[PDB]
Structure formats: structure tokens, C-alpha cells
Amino acid sequence: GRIIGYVPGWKTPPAAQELASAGYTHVMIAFGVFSTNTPGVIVPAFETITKEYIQSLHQAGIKVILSLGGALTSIPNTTVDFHQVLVASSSPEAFKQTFINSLKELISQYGFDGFDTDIEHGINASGSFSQPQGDIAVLASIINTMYSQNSSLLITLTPQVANIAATSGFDQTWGNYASLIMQTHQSLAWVGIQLYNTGCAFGIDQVCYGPTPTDTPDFSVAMATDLLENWPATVNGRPTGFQPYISYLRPSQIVIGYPSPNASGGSDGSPVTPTTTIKRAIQCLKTAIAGNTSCGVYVPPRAYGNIGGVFNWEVTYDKNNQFKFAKELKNCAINGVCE
């Protein structure tokens, strides 16, 4: 499995040897944003991150992925809204060609191993959940074309829970990444779930789980389960109204994502889930056996074995906390030894 760290491109990054020693296997450079003047062009917003620094990561054995989108941009004539630049293009085909060429250019120039979809704005639902049109169809085409041309690319999705949790919804918030996953699963290294900055969302049991309380793994386990299982139309004689999500993902394509605390307990993301709970979530997904080192009340419908690992937003917090997030999770996330 994997220990994944987000590296903000507006802060001095930790040394590659510090990250490798802590147990990091992958880092995610935040962020590429979207040109409003050449629709499809990706504008690098990581001034603190050099090709030399990325070489240092590779020399330490860490893979380096370019994260696209994010929450906002301050670069003039840029947006983090995908739809906005897709519709600004002369055609969806021109947009796709420009986006692919621009992404290939950045990958070649910086030596990236792949790219991450952290597109939090402007993945609007069109067509049907099972046969999406518009934004999801175009993004799926970009992902599947990039992977078809280079099956070594690490292509990841980093959804918010509303985007992937069992839902009747299909819009820019609800179920959009679940729809995208059915179109792209064959191309994806992993889907990393943002288990923070969210209200509760539904498990396939029709129970609404949120990140608090953080002393049980239920939320982490239920959200991973929502990606690993078909969404049922009926639960115990009742209609769910759930979209017809069919799971095509392997456990190795599931990553659970959290905010890392600094030494003071501060974080960029709320709430902070302690590493003891994260290990319980992985042990629970592995075994589907409840206990004080494994499942709480929520037990998934089967044992999955080892999932894909863990990420944190973001490594400058973890560094300040002597890399306790990576150090405490690496035996569990990487070697699958969680109790």
C-alpha cells in the first residue's frame, strides 16, 4: 500500500529524504489550475516546487503526481472550475486536445508520474448517472485517453464524500465522482476519499455517517464500502432511491484521506481523525471483524483485504508534528499490519 502526502506549491516543501524516511511513497503537488484565456491549458500554481526538487523525490524513491483543481486560485485569468473552461472552448474536442497536450507538456517538463483530479468545482451532471454527458463524459475521455496512450501514468481521483457516497442525487455535489468512476475505473491508480470538511453522507445501509465522532472508524469504513459495493435499490423492504452505482474498483484502488495535525493539534481540514482510528478503519476493511483494533458498529458486507493506503492534507502540518501521521500509519498502510 501507499502513504500519500499533499505538497502545497505555495509553501517550502519538506526535503525528499525527510519524506522518504517518514514512510511517504507518493506526493501530490498542489495545484495545476485552468487558464480562462486558452481553455484547456493547465497553469502551474506551485512556484515553490522545482523540477530539481521533483528529481530529489524520485532519487528518494517517491512517486510525484500533479494535482489539478483545488478550492480556489489567485492567479489572474485562471479558474478551478472545470465546466467553466470546457464551455469557454470552441468545442469539447478542442478542449480535450488542448487539455491533454497541456497536461503532457507539464508532465514532461516537471517529470510527473501522473495526475490527480481534485476538481471541487464545475463537474456538473448531464445525461444519466450510468451514461453521463457533458463535464463527466469529457473528463472521463481525457482520463481514459491519457491512460490508453501511457498505461504507466498514475491517474487518481480525490473526491469529497458527497461526490462518491450512496445517494439519489446526481449533480455537481452528489454522486458526480461515482458516475465518473464507472466510466474510468480501468484507468485509475486510486480514488482518495476526503474524510473531512463534510457533513454526513450515506452508507449502503442508509445510515448517514460523518467524520465526527473521530473515535470510531465507521465513517471511513462506510465511505470506502460505498465505492467497493453496488448501491442497493432496496434496504430491508424500503426504497433507497440510490443511483445504480456498480462497483468496478479493487480494494487497492481505495485510499482514505485525512487532515494531518501539526505539533499543536492545528490542521488545514476538520476534524482531525487520530491514527488509532485510521488503523481501525484499514483493519476493519481488511477483515470485516469488529473489535477494539478493527470495526466499530459499522461492519462492511465482506472482508476486502488490504486497501490502497492513506493520504494526508498536507505534509507541512505532518512535518511540524515530526511526521507522526506517516510514521504511525506506514506499517498498516504499506505492509497491511494494522493491529
Residue numbers in the entry: 424 to 762
Question: Mind quoting what the paper says about this structure?
Answer:
Among the L. pneumophila type II substrates, ChiA is an 81 kDa endochitinase with a novel amino acid sequence at its N-terminus and a putative glycosyl hydrolase 18 (GH18) domain at its C-terminus. ChiA is composed of four domains (N1, N2, N3 and CTD, from N- to C-terminus) which have structural homology to those associated with other chitinase enzymes. Using chitin binding and chitinase activity assays, we show that ChiA-N1 is a chitin binding module and we confirm that ChiA-CTD is a glycosyl hydrolase domain. Lastly, our structural and biochemical studies demonstrate that ChiA-CTD has novel peptidase activity against mucin-like glycoproteins, which is independent of its chitinase active site.
We readily obtained crystals for ChiA-CTD and its structure was determined using iodide single isomorphous replacement with anomalous scattering (I-SIRAS) phasing. Electron-density maps were refined to 1.7 Å and the final model contains two identical chains, with all molecules built except for the N-terminal His6-tags and adjacent ChiA-CTD residues Val419 to Gly424. Each chain forms an anticipated GH18 α/β-fold and is composed of 11 β-strands and 13 α-helices. High concentrations of 2-methyl-2,4-pentanediol (MPD) were used as a precipitant during crystallization and we observed four MPD molecules in the final model; one bound to the catalytic Asp541 and Glu543 residues (MPD-1) and one within a hydrophobic pocket formed by the α5 helix and α5-α5′/β5-β6′ loops (MPD-2). The chitinase active sites of ChiNCTU2 and ChiA-CTD have high primary sequence identity and tertiary structure homology and modelling of chitotetraose binding indicates that chitin lines a negatively charged valley on the surface of ChiA-CTD. Chitotetraose overlays with MPD-1 in the active site and the MPD-2 site is positioned adjacent to the reducing end of the modelled chitotetraose. However, L. pneumophila ChiA-CTD also possesses unique features that are not observed in homologous structures. These include an additional α-helix (α3), an extended β3-α3 loop, an extended α6-α6′ loop and an extended β7-α7 loop. Examination of the ChiA-CTD structure suggests that His544, Asn547 and Gln595 are ligands for the zinc, with Asp504 the general base. Furthermore, the MPD-2 site which we observed in the crystal structure of ChiA-CTD may also represent an additional glycan surface to accommodate branched glycan structures.
